[model samples]
Target chain A: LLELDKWASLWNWFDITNWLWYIRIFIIIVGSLIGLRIVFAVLSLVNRVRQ
Target chain B: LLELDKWASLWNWFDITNWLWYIRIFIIIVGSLIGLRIVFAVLSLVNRVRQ
Candidate 1:
């Protein structure tokens, strides 16, 4: 129903030239890759100290 | 498109009966509490040794 307005463009994440989509993509790919190293150590360190 | 009709579900953790979910949740809750205690000790030790 909200889409009845012509000015509504919140779904632009799928289209080109959208910064939100770009940032989401950047975080998902780059951030996840960088997290690989810490995730392993973090998991073990967390487990070792948790109990 | 690869979603086969009722077979392998990757989101097993979403189920309440999954042991993995309980383990993960326990770590998240209790782990953070204990992790905070370890962080204080680790930080103080690091500072004492570094300086």
Candidate 2:
């Protein structure tokens, strides 16, 4: 159940816990992509070094 | 690097994938909580019905 006061404005979402909650999810998604980049970068380096 | 047209828009976050993407994670999180609720609800039914 959502706990919200009718008087509370949407800006209340800017609270740090709220901010971190959203930013955490976004960072997970974006970091997954960046990690994908890093994996290939290292794998390429390994293959190049092997050859 | 961020992809955007500075003045093109902000609510541009309204993309379907954007909505579904974050929602999938949140759904799992909430579903776990709801499932937790269901477990407790059923525990009594199982206990009461067992007798």
Candidate 3:
């Protein structure tokens, strides 16, 4: 039972760690998409101004 | 020593929880901005066509 408790604690730690990684990845992807949109909008505005 | 370990574990959990909350807020704001952009683009296209 003591060994099982140790394994359980370790599993919980791993679960938290995995979730943190996934959240960080999601933030990065979403941030990148926002950056892309901002770039596109800037380019479009510039083209409109030039014309 | 045992109490210190428990405190450390609690602190780690709290830190991860805060990080998750921050990520959620960031995603919500970015998603909202993207939605606003789509709405604005649609309105602009309609105006252009009407003109």
Best by DockQ: 3
**Cα misplacement distance, residue A18 of candidate 2 (Å):** 4.7
Which CAPRI category fits model 2?
A: incorrect
Tens digits of lDDT, candidate 3, B1-51? 124466467776597757646877777677777766765445554654686
C-alpha root-mean-square deviation, each candidate: 12.5, 18.3, 7.4
DockQ of each: 0.03, 0.02, 0.10
lDDT of 2 by residue, A1-51 (tens): 233432244456557546744675664474344334333433443453585
The digit string of per-residue lDDT tens for model 1 on B1-51 reads 223322246455546446434644543454445444445545544553576
Model 3 alpha-carbon miss at residue B22, Å = 2.3
Query: Between the candidate structures 2 and 3, which one is better when assessed by DockQ?
Result: 3
lDDT of 2 by residue, B1-51 (tens): 123443236456657646645865764565445434434434444543575
Q: What shift in Å separates residue A3 of candidate 2 from its native position after superposition?
A: 3.2
Best-performing candidate as measured by lDDT: 3
TM-scores across all candidates?
Answer: 0.21, 0.24, 0.40
